[PDB]
Design an enzyme around this catalytic site. Structure first.
Site, PDB file in Angstrom:
ATOM      1  N   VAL B  77      -8.952  -7.274  -0.673  1.00 22.66           N
ATOM      2  CA  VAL B  77      -8.696  -7.872   0.629  1.00 22.66           C
ATOM      3  C   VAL B  77      -8.370  -9.350   0.466  1.00 22.66           C
ATOM      4  O   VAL B  77      -8.356 -10.103   1.438  1.00 22.66           O
ATOM      5  CB  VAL B  77      -9.896  -7.681   1.571  1.00 22.66           C
ATOM      6  CG1 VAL B  77     -11.081  -8.504   1.100  1.00 22.66           C
ATOM      7  CG2 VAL B  77      -9.525  -8.060   2.983  1.00 22.66           C
ATOM      8  N   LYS B  78      -8.105  -9.756  -0.770  1.00 18.73           N
ATOM      9  CA  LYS B  78      -7.847 -11.143  -1.109  1.00 18.73           C
ATOM     10  C   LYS B  78      -6.377 -11.331  -1.478  1.00 18.73           C
ATOM     11  O   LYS B  78      -5.990 -12.397  -2.021  1.00 18.73           O
ATOM     12  CB  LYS B  78      -8.768 -11.545  -2.257  1.00 18.73           C
ATOM     13  CG  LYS B  78      -9.812 -12.569  -1.822  1.00 18.73           C
ATOM     14  CD  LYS B  78     -10.685 -12.067  -0.677  1.00 18.73           C
ATOM     15  CE  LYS B  78     -12.007 -11.555  -1.229  1.00 18.73           C
ATOM     16  NZ  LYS B  78     -12.844 -12.677  -1.607  1.00 18.73           N
ATOM     17  N   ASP B  79      -5.592 -10.273  -1.313  1.00 22.74           N
ATOM     18  CA  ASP B  79      -4.159 -10.334  -1.534  1.00 22.74           C
ATOM     19  C   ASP B  79      -3.506 -10.909  -0.285  1.00 22.74           C
ATOM     20  O   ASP B  79      -2.531 -11.668  -0.361  1.00 22.74           O
ATOM     21  CB  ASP B  79      -3.605  -8.948  -1.846  1.00 22.74           C
ATOM     22  CG  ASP B  79      -4.114  -8.400  -3.162  1.00 22.74           C
ATOM     23  OD1 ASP B  79      -4.464  -9.202  -4.053  1.00 22.74           O
ATOM     24  OD2 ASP B  79      -4.169  -7.163  -3.305  1.00 22.74           O
TER      25      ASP B  79
END
Ligand code: HEM
Ligand code: HEM
Lengths: 507, 507, 128
Positions: B77-79
């Site tokens: 979810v850090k893309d």
């Protein structure tokens, strides 16, 4: 009794026949709901990604596209077939709730079936060759599937091959079923129904070449059949690793070895579902180029794919040379890199297997790669015992201007490191009183290095540890029997120091 | 000079203000094209999956939903934030082509930035603590990013913390930028713009509770702000692992240890982007329950998620108890299991760390788990040298009815195994002439086991090898100085034999 | 039966190897693999104290030459019949090692020495 997986196909399909004559129950793709009832519905609708740099690097005038099937729930293009065969078995009444599922697989189909069974409660037994990666084993263990291994070099007709072992298990365990992806029409049917439609809609029904790796043969078979029914102008290209016999004409299969590291493709027999008549041309591939192209894909396009994808792209860069500007090519990327973390993704494994050479690895490296550590500016004027208090260390460090000092016991054993800034921050935060020992702040983790080592080794070490301590060992002798060991610390080098040295020497 | 990551937020946002006053450049989510120009466009539009079994197991009357963000290109979810910060820097002119990007991360943001840089050509330097898994290091190496490690226990204000090391590198390397996810408004803004909208559309704008793990705080912060602007009735629940100070009131943070195995969540400081005022309630979690729930998710729902997802679900099963039938809960699953293959996904690692007990592991096992191997029906009447020809072995096996026999050298060293069926098939296929030695057919791979071992150990062995040879070692003495070693083979047990024995003893 | 000794080893040599590992007894086997008998730590100590042997003497004078070979498949009832005539029942195993179907050879080894004491202990412990 036993039914072979290489038996000739009884299918009567031929180009030009109408779909209304199909005995099979085709499933029309449908839009999934905004909330998925289960993870299994997140299968299909995979993206098409344009390859940007590799085509230019290898002089392709045509547009190159990748069908990234490694984004499915299970991370493979074998989740589609797992779901389709399970659904067809449920619909036909062959499979009942609580039954036991046995499947001989290379791991990806086993993972898909295990996931579906866990969601739906079925028992799963996976028969997988020995050469497949241990990551698949770990995933299957997590999913609750039972795993049976078979020799890599066992012939398919042998009684201890994965297919044979599965057959033996089925006759033993009651209420057990084998879906037999090598013979099930559901395998190619899933692709013919969903994957080809997705490709056509994403490509707007226009494409000139398609490249796909061949294992069971369903992926290429269904896609080729649907495309020839809808886009006859597309050239179908098959990829078969060296050591397999799927590729035709037979002249291509003349090789001395039948063992290859690539997983999930190639077989010692012709699967029933594989229709070699629709494949326009075949190419052989080797492990070296496959892994090289997989690494290149990861590094240049961001596609975290496996070896089979690398083989497919390696074959495509050759096949598409006949194409020209304005034409389009499509390649299927079956699986993800999750199943190969300790495999080609690791440089050590490739060097051990011989797919990488020191000359190739070092030629791309900077000028300072081969310099030895001793050339750095490094010194360790002082060290401290673990028993010294924090404030005492603050005083001895500030009075001399040093920011850090190693920690060594009385016998000379290195215990770690301490830094002035960390101690000051801890004192401000109250985590340690000034009278407390430094042992509560020392950095226990470090890596020993020697003066003769190169800076490349130092960098590789620094990718795993912050501190690289330059330790030298001296052995002291008394009578050739009473040997003793001594060691001392010289320099603590971090990425900061290495880059500062590089910058200084660069001017 | 240095700007701290814990500095109080200068944002003036408060509930009820209109979006027209926002200084920030909001990006409206848009439908991606049928063909993605690059892999980066496959970010967002993640599925919502209903949790089916865990809620029933823990008595939840409400609908439980999972925002599976581990399906993005980078598997995290850090893309989203990586792409958003890179795009914002490009638009503002701060970042130029060919520049160098430095980011202190727990690995997931580093992976996203490395992927974006590789796609777009930027240089990437990743500062990552030591405790993070080596799988992230391997992926970053493949993507071409430079990796710098920092001590796990280093305080953020220290000069050798990941943030501090990044700051030091930036002042050294020219044309370098730090995006500073701990301070960049783009981090929470990405979620506020895309993730909250996706959640609302998938939930039809109706949801009562949201549970999310807290690292940098952007994920929960943006979602909570957007939801309170649009769905004020939603309860926002935060999860902070034991050993961190993010959770409030401060009474929850009273613990003796600040080291925890879970990755990507919890910090020793309050990030600027984290707005703790919108979090209705907080829960603390421990590594044991996190990994237990992650394994349960994998085994029962098919969600290949990491430890943070486990912590989130563990907190949710408690928080949702206040809910009733007809209500809905949402949990965010940040990352995938690819980054933890050798970690909790491995039973050995959990046993070493103490998160699993032998009593718990064996209580679920069948009745025959603890039986010793000797209780099986096993015998090795004969063995052969590697030099014997194929046909000779066929004769000696068929004349006695045995299907297989071990291969042992003159000194007694076991070389592998041979089987009648494999040799017969090879002779039919022409791979070996009858006069050829069996060494070209022997199975080189096998595992040694001892009579005292349990059947559970045998099964664990069989998950990696087809043949488990029951070997016994005898040491022969002459004068207490001239010791010699002897060994012999008794029984070759496979999954087939074990299951046959289980079935026989079951009746 | 982790270890075995050749008949030529000395009693003093045998005493230490047994005690350094705790085993009260060890089978006696020649170089080829022919079992010669059984020797026990307790008898060696008693014989040494009795003066019948010196620590330098070979174990062949203390070895028990009488025993009965048994195999894993045999029932305990068969073992009980054997134990009515011999103290030691040696669990032997036999393998035929082939070279060309004409040049066969036989190998054997020992794995357990069971007496009436061991049998009764197993019965009592398992009786539950
Ligand atoms: C469209 C007209 C088609 C016709 C008339 C047809 C005909 C048949 C028939 C009659 C069978 C049963 C044979 C038996 O039970 O012995 C069969 C099986 C099968 N079909 Fe088709 N089929 C068609 C399309 C397809 C397509 C589109 C695929 C794959 C994409 C396919 C793949 C298979 C396979 C793999 C089998 C199993 C053959 C075996 O197990 O020996 N068929 N087909
Ligand atoms: C909607 C009305 C909003 C207003 C009037 C507002 C106001 C501001 C202003 C004036 C700044 C610049 C402060 C400075 O440069 O010193 C700022 C920065 C920032 N904004 Fe907002 N904002 C709004 C919405 C949001 C939202 C929706 C988010 C997150 C979802 C957000 C997160 C941030 C963050 C993290 C910063 C950085 C603060 C710092 O670095 O100290 N803001 N905001």
């Amino acid at each position: 009794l036993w039914i072979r997986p290489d038996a000739p196909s009884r299918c009567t399909w031929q180009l030009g026949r109408p779909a209304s004559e199909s005995p099979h129950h085709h499933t029309a793709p449908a839009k999934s709901p905004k909330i998925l009832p289960d993870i299994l519905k997140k299968i299909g609708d995979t993206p098409m990604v344009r390859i940007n740099k590799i085509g230019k690097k290898f002089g392709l005038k045509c547009e190159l596209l990748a069908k990234c099937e490694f984004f499915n729930a299970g991370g493979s293009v074998k989740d589609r077939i797992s779901l389709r065969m399970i659904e067809d078995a449920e619909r036909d009444g062959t499979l009942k709730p609580g039954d036991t599922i046995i499947e001989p697989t290379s791991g990806n189909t086993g993972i898909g079936l295990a996931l579906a069974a866990a969601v739906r409660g079925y028992r799963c037994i996976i028969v997988m060759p020995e050469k497949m990666s241990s990551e698949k084993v770990d995933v299957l263990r997590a999913l609750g599937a039972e795993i049976v291994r078979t020799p890599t070099n066992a012939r398919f007709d042998s009684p201890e091959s994965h297919v044979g072992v599965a057959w033996r298990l089925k006759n033993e365990i009651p209420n057990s079923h084998i879906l037999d992806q090598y013979r099930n029409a559901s395998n190619p049917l899933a692709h013919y129904d969903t994957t080809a439609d997705e490709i056509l809609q994403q490509c707007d029904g226009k494409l000139d070449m398609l490249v796909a790796s061949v294992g069971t043969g369903g992926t290429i078979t269904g896609i080729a059949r649907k495309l020839k029914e809808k886009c006859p102008g597309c050239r179908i290209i098959g990829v078969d690793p060296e050591g397999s016999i799927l590729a035709e004409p037979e002249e291509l299969n003349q090789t001395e070895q039948t063992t290859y590291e690539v997983e999930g493709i190639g077989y010692d027999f012709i699967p029933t579902v594989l229709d070699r008549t629709v494949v326009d041309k075949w190419f052989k591939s080797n492990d070296e180029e496959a892994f090289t192209f997989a690494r290149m894909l990861i590094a240049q396009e961001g596609l975290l794919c496996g070896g089979s994808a690398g083989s497919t792209v390696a074959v495509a860069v050759k096949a598409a040379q006949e194409l020209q500007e304005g034409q389009r090519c499509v390649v299927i990327l079956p699986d993800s890199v999750r199943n190969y973390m300790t495999k080609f993704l690791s440089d050590r494994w490739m060097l051990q297997k011989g797919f990488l050479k020191e000359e190739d690895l070092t030629e791309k490296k900077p000028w300072w790669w081969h310099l030895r550590v001793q050339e750095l500016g490094l010194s360790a004027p002082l060290t401290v015992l673990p028993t010294i208090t924090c404030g005492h260390t603050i005083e001895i460090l500030r009075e001399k201007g040093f920011d850090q000092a190693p920690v060594v016991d009385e016998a000379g054993v290195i215990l770690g490191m301490v830094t002035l800034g960390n101690m000051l921050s801890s004192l401000l935060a109250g985590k340690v009183q000034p009278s407390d020992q430094v042992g509560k702040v020392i950095y226990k983790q470090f890596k020993q290095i020697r003066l003769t080592d190169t800076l490349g080794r130092l960098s590789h070490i620094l990718e795993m540890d912050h501190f690289a301590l330059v330790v030298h060992e001296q052995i002291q002798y008394h009578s050739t029997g009473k040997s003793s060991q001594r060691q001392m610390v010289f320099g603590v080098v971090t990425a900061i120091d290495l880059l500062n040295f590089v910058a200084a020497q660069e001017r």
